[PDB]
Amino acid sequence: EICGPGIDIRNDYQQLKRLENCTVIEGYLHILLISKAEDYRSYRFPKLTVITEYLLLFRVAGLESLGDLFPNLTVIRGWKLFYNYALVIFEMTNLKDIGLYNLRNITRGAIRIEKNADLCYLSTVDWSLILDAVSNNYIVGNKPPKECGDLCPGTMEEKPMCEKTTINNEYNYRCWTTNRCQKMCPSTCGKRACTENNECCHPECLGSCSAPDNDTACVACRHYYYAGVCVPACPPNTYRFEGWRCVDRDFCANILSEGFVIHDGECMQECPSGFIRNGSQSMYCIPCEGPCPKVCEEEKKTKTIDSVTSAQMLQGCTIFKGNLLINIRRGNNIASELENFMGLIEVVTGYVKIRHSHALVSLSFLKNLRLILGEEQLEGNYSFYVLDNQNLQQLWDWDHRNLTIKAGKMYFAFNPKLCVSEIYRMEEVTGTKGRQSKGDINTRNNGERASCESDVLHFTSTTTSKNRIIITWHRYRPPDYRDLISFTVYYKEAPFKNVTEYDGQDACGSNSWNMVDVDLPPNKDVEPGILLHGLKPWTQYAVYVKAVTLTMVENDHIRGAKSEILYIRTNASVPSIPLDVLSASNSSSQLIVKWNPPSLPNGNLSYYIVRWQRQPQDGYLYRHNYCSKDKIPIRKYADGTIPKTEAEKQAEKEEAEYRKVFENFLHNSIFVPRPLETEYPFFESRVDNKERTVISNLRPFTLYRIDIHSCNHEAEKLGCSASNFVFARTMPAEGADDIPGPVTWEPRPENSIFLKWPEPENPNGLILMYEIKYGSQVEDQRECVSRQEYRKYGGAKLNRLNPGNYTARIQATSLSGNGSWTDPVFFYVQA
């Protein structure tokens, strides 16, 4: 049967036995923290063919291979992902290999396989034919690749049984575990699955088939499954479900949950963005006018919001059928998360109180609050009521928002940093121009310590580079020039021109903006300015300047200036390297090269220049004498024994104030009124709006360095990019390594013999070895000949044989691998 949701095995092998009735899992299937049960080879689950979301394995002790758990697991669909990963293998002790030898086609996600100290057969898997996005894998830690051995089945037997495929420069047999190969379909079944005996699957199939060209024989479907038939899309009587199957409305009505809903042909737990149920509990949905109106009623009439998580039960809302009492103190992430929880609240039917909310500098987190109905009111008919907010500075951006109060008075008290002009502008737009009077707006305690009037710091000049902005503004001098102590320049990455000052800034010190200070220039002719550096090319920054000033005169005679928020786009630049160049040759003379966009798109990416050049072979291989022992996989033993602060700025302000007053005392007391190496040709091509290309007309098994440069609308001026590069290997030509002529034997003095064979015409790289198997009626003896020995003598000597019906066969080992064994040669030794 089908199983789910979300299988989770968490303590012991006995809990695994939930799986043996499961062939498809409509969930993840975690297995975590299992202690070794000493039941060994028990607890196999061969019924399992598909995991829909993601397989996650953590700390499962004693599990030597997942092929023992899920021998027939064929597809991990990745409909839901574990942080973009569909297969996760973390801290899995004793795990020698992944071993999921029937896993063919992971439909979505990446494969993180982390810190599994004994895990081998990772590099033997060509995930590029299991996965579309190998670049996201993150195979970090595990057993070091130099210590794995990774021998494929048949390799140690000299009878390799697995397929080979190029991953960049590397071309070796592909395997899941020491005994089993990775199953790959022949080239004829283009983008199809196939059965075990090579016969192509039905086009709508996935992974494997019991019988070819049959919709009913699939172990997994691409697109959808219905009554055993794989289907491109659900038959019109049925609806798509959990990313993999078709179920009738009579099924989707019966799932426990208001029940599941049907929309755009698929059945879901809740109807998606912009759609709402027909009415009450009903299966069909309609598009919504705005975000779909949700009532958010609470049995408590007044919902207190006193911590950032206390608003979490709003979670997304449209109409709060009660009253709000915001009370937020501390937390430093407040507005950016209060907007996550409450920004969608369009209507508050009761009153809104903002009391002791010392964290908030702006109520703009209540982004979409269009109405406060005030059907219920606190006391004295108050409907919007803020009290004792030590850091409130703004209510809403009244240049943009049209809040309205249907009934009740507005009230504001003890808001040192929130200006009475701002609360008046609120009442000018909220429809409350005459509800409250006198003491409701006392003006004694609101804005008492706020900069409520500002001159404009006009930007005089701007200059940009790939990583710099140099900006200046008009010379500002308040009536007392002394009280301008510095300018603060606030800049932030602002892709869109809607950023106001209070995008953050909640009273916890640092905020979303970066900021840097400019002292008043000593030379009166020089204009103030800043060089912002460390910026990103082509990105738009919101930059604005504020004058840091004293308050000595009070009575609002302080005039703290602001600049207008200037959106400056840094110059477009040479793009960074195009990330994760990866290549695979589906044929000799061809190379599919794929990559990802550059880490920084330093301009509107126009195209990519792909640049392939051949590479010389000799300077590593041509003298290596491969018929001698390589360095053994020796293991390493363990080794390795044994921004100015607010207080600072307040100190500067206080020292400036004390200097000002003492200069005043100076003047008013002193002054008295009178009474084979070659550089192969480059090749270049331009690819537009496509992060992959098929380089063609190449050589058999030839190493091509592929440079890739991303380009933007500045390419003619600045060049394209620093090359990201991959050394790509073309697929070998079949049979190009088998000897092109009949081998010959010839006599030598004493018991020795000589054998001679011609060099291959177009070898798949250098022929680094020639193996000779020889013996009488049995190839009882091995020998091998280096490339150098052939370049010396042609053939090779066989030493001190015995008379008999001796036989020999020869096999060239090129850089791609061994070619076909030659036809046998018969020879004998004289008496």
Partner: protein, 55 residues
């Protein structure tokens, strides 16, 4: 306009740059320049800085 700090003494020295600055000697028995020219809304005067020169 107003002259307060470095500017006030620089202007005063430019006004009286050889005439010199006056001294009280009041015989043991008043807002000042930093008030008439800077701190109050009164504003400074090139025709009143002359009053603080010695003559």
């Amino acid at each position: 306009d107003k002259l307060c700090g470095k500017d006030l003494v620089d202007a005063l020295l430019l006004v009286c740059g050889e005439k010199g600055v006056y001294s009280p000697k009041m015989g043991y028995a008043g807002n000042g320049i930093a008030d008439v020219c800077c701190t109050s809304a009164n504003g400074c005067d090139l025709n009143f800085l002359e009053k603080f020169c010695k003559t």
